[PDB]
Amino acid sequence: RGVTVPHNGESKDYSV
Numbered sequence: 001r002g003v004t005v006p007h008n009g010e011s012k013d014y015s016v
Contacts, residue, residue: 002016
């Protein structure tokens with residue numbers, strides 16, 4: 001599964 005790195009109030013989804 002990818003790692004979710006949410007920024008300043010934002011949600012990021014990293015697919016590895």
